[PDB]
């Protein structure tokens, strides 16, 4: 009966009109390409936000006979029933790129059943709803709404089969209600992530030891238990298991008890992205400013290094970022290396903006830059009419404002310049702050390497480091994402695309993707999994120095084969993976009508085994 | 970015020889940013820039709060406080104090006790009418021409 | 160029705390640009501009001729 | 060879028509490219820049001058 060839689909997530983490990312950035091949056949769903939908969202008019075609009536007249049983939302465009329609459902509009609802869960399958947790109880909410809206579709629509994409946990109860009301509905549920993945690698092992540990209990630990059933369920009743990289695989097989079917990698509105000596400048500029007063190092011999993120201090990697630093420092000192590496951390944190200090530095070096400008442009118009009139250039009035200028870059005795640019809030307590004093990188003239914490996002009117994230990503030579949980890693993978080398990690998601399609590339992949964390520290270091003792001319290549890696990551080509994503759920769904639509019966294990 | 691509488009259009000259694209971005300007309701425009460390009994503020003058459309004046020295660099009123003055239209020093005042007198060298008093050094000064 | 050459030492030495500032290099390519500016002998500056098809005929070459400029 | 993008036409050894066939041989070829080959043709021509500079070409000045005083004074060179 039902249609293969062209069918609906239906993607749900806590995040499609809020921005609320980073599947919001994934699906805004996704939008485009999705669209162009479902046009009004494809629509979003997801809870509506109250306070931001109206920043988001061009709010439709779905009871107009224009709204849908006459082919989609069925979706309309499933919104009517929904809103008949007083189920209140919104329909429209979410305002991203590609424009694609949205149903935000109402879960104040539905509170009433929630007792009704927290309970017909539980009698099918087991999973409590503590009323203290208002994650849960919304995840419920969704769940119940959006499999009544899609047993309506189902039940409404007899042309086209019908595709159910959801994304987490929280945005996973409408699966198991699907497979056990036997709707005819084919669904796939990707993590990006695991609850217990999360939770474990709080404190600081796990790549060796999830093999060996009781799920059951330790959820139970993290007072976690039933969020974890949730999770759990939601990956049998689905159709298709899908996780966003090789290394969350990993994780959930062991954690969730079941293999996932393929990879969903997340790929990138390239495009979006589109020099280097350009915002270089901008760098030198804070630099020089930042350095006054012991500028004893050629910044035509200095590499810019950067770490950048969520502060997360383990997860994201900044402890190996640092420690890797101050050893990479002896291995220049005691090479007597002529280079200089500035290493910025960028990741925001409490504080109360730019230091008095930092500030200063900044100014001064301003005026300096103003003070020779003037005096050149003096000069040049002497040298010129004189020149011109044929047949200490530097008169006394410009000697006195250059000395002054000069004289204000004095640095107090013995100061030195700051590991930070701003005053932190919690300036004891915090982990980089106490990480880069413990391994006593202070930025003295010896140090090969200096250290720069700049603990807030970059802007580019800002008085200090005066770029834009993305300027400024341009303006270094190398990125170094040591992270130790990252089911995918978005702040790897812009580095690259934006054409600059990185290192990466091989219990990162977009680094064990990486390792799959070496070094000279661009990307560098630390084995963080394998190898003891000393091993995995020597490695980064390993690299970095690699980096360092690399000529102008080697250097100049890496980014131009970096710069070309760039459109291998584009949803043009990644999006290829949800096809197959998509495709292996009606082929399990339908295994006949597949089969007459090929002519043969292909694999159903694998979406690589169907492909 | 959306005005120069309708231009290229004018452009293009033009030089082949031999309604809509935004494609639905450019409308949703547009869109996007006029709706990211909406006021919450009923909060109108701060008479402050910044975080005061001591908002409660701060004089300035207190007094414009005494007064009332809380920028609703139906004042006719506004009232903005900048509790810092003006920056070109600064994320808000990037300037100089010296541009700031300049873009200005009137500087008003009503000062009760000021020996001279540098501040009116260089509003003026700058070539921006000012009030000041005639208990300020350059008021009294000012009166004599 | 030259200026800006200036300009960078300028600003590197005094980045650095803690009389001739053009190298000879610089001090050749102005050399040249300045012994370019040469009139050869007695040359005077045009009093026109361009290759004038009538010239001998022309009344305003002629009047300005005839008076002397 | 053609990957640095430097193309050599035979006008030396093919008859002067066949000379003019490979010459157009060598633009279809170009036009036919699509903009990453390109992109990395002139990359690679970029490095060859370098290996044009006196830098490097002088050293050919230097083998010759040598070769002067090899062959002017046999006795004090091969002492030397």
Request: glycine fraction near 6%.
């Amino acid at each position: 009966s039902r249609d293969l060839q062209n069918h609906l689909l239906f993607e749900t997530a806590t995040e499609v009109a809020n921005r609320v983490g980073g599947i919001y990312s994934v699906l805004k950035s996704k939008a485009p390409i999705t669209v162009a091949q479902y046009k009004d056949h494809y629509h979003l769903i997801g809870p509506l936000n109250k306070a931001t939908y109206q920043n988001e969202v061009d709010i439709l008019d779905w009871k107009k006979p224009e709204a849908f075609s006459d082919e989609m009536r069925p979706v309309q007249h499933a919104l009517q029933t929904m809103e008949s049983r007083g189920v209140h939302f919104v329909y429209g465009r979410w305002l991203i790129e590609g424009a694609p329609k949205v149903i935000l459902f109402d879960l104040d509009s539905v509170r009433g059943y929630s007792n009704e609802w927290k309970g017909d869960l539980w009698s099918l399958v087991g999973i409590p709803s503590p009323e203290n947790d208002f994650e849960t109880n919304d995840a419920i909410l969704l769940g119940y709404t959006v499999a009544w809206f899609l047993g309506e579709v189902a039940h409404l629509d007899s042309q086209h089969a019908i595709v159910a994409h959801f994304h987490e946990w929280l945005a996973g109860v409408a699966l198991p209600l699907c497979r056990k009301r036997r709707i005819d509905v084919v669904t796939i549920f990707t993590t990006h992530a695991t609850l217990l993945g999360r939770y474990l690698c709080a404190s600081g092992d796990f790549y060796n030891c999830l093999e060996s540990v009781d799920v059951d209990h330790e959820a139970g630990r993290f007072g976690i238990y039933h969020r974890y059933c949730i999770e759990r369920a939601a990956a049998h009743s689905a159709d298709v298991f899908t996780t966003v990289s090789q290394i969350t695989a990993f994780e959930a097989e062991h954690l969730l008890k079941r293999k996932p079917d393929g990879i969903l990698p997340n790929g990138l509105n390239v495009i979006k992205f589109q020099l280097h000596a350009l915002k270089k400048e901008k760098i030198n500029d804070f630099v020089r400013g930042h350095f006054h007063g012991c500028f004893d190092f050629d910044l035509d011999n200095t590499l810019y290094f950067f770490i950048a993120g969520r502060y997360e201090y383990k997860n994201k990697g900044a402890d190996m970022f640092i420690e890797a630093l101050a050893r990479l420092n002896y291995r220049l000192k005691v090479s007597g290396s002529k280079k200089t590496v500035v290493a910025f951390i960028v990741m925001p944190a409490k504080n109360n903006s730019f230091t008095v200090e930092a500030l200063k530095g900044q100014a001064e070096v301003r005026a300096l830059e103003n003070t020779v400008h003037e005096v050149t442009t003096s000069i040049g118009k002497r040298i010129f009419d004189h020149a011109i009139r044929y047949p200490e250039l530097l008169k006394s009035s410009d000697k006195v404002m250059l000395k002054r200028r000069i004289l204000a870059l004095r640095r107090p005795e013995g100061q030195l310049p700051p590991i930070v640019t701003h005053n932190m809030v919690d300036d004891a307590n915090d982990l980089i702050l106490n990480k880069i004093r413990q391994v006593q990188l202070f930025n003295s003239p010896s140090d090969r390497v200096k250290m720069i914490f700049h603990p807030e996002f970059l802007n580019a009117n800002n008085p200090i480091l005066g770029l834009d994230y993305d300027e400024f990503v341009r303006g270094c030579h190398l990125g170094v994402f040591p992270s130790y949980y990252e089911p995918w890693g978005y702040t790897p993978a812009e580095c690259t695309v934006m054409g600059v080398p990185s290192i990466t990690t091989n219990v990162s998601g977009f680094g064990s993707y990486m390792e799959d399609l070496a070094k000279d590339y661009g990307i560098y992949i630390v084995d963080r999994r394998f190898k003891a964390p000393d091993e995995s520290v020597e490695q980064l270091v390993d690299y970095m120095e690699e980096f360092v003792k690399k000529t102008a001319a080697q250097a100049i290549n890496q980014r131009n084969r970096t710069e070309r890696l760039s459109d291998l990551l584009d949803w043009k080509r990644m999006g290829l993976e949800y096809v197959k994503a998509r495709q292996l759920a009606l082929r399990r769904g339908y295994p006949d009508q597949f089969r007459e639509l090929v002519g043969e019966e292909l694999n159903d294990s694998n979406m690589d085994a169907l492909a | 970015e959306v005005t120069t691509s309708i231009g290229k488009r004018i452009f293009d259009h033009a030089i082949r020889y031999p309604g809509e000259l935004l494609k639905s694209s450019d409308k949703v971005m547009l869109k996007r940013r006029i709706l990211a300007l909406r006021r919450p309701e009923g909060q109108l425009p701060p008479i402050v820039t910044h975080n005061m460390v001591d908002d409660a009994n701060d004089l300035i503020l207190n007094k414009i709060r005494q007064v009332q003058l809380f920028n609703s459309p139906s004042d006719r004046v506004k009232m903005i406080f900048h509790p810092e020295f003006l920056n070109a660099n600064n994320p808000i009123l990037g300037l100089d104090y010296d541009e700031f003055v300049r873009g200005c239209h009137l500087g008003v020093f009503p000062s009760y006790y000021e020996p001279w005042g540098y501040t009116p007198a260089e509003c003026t060298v700058m070539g921006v009418p000012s009030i000041t008093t005639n208990v300020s050094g350059f008021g009294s000064y000012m009166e004599d021409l």
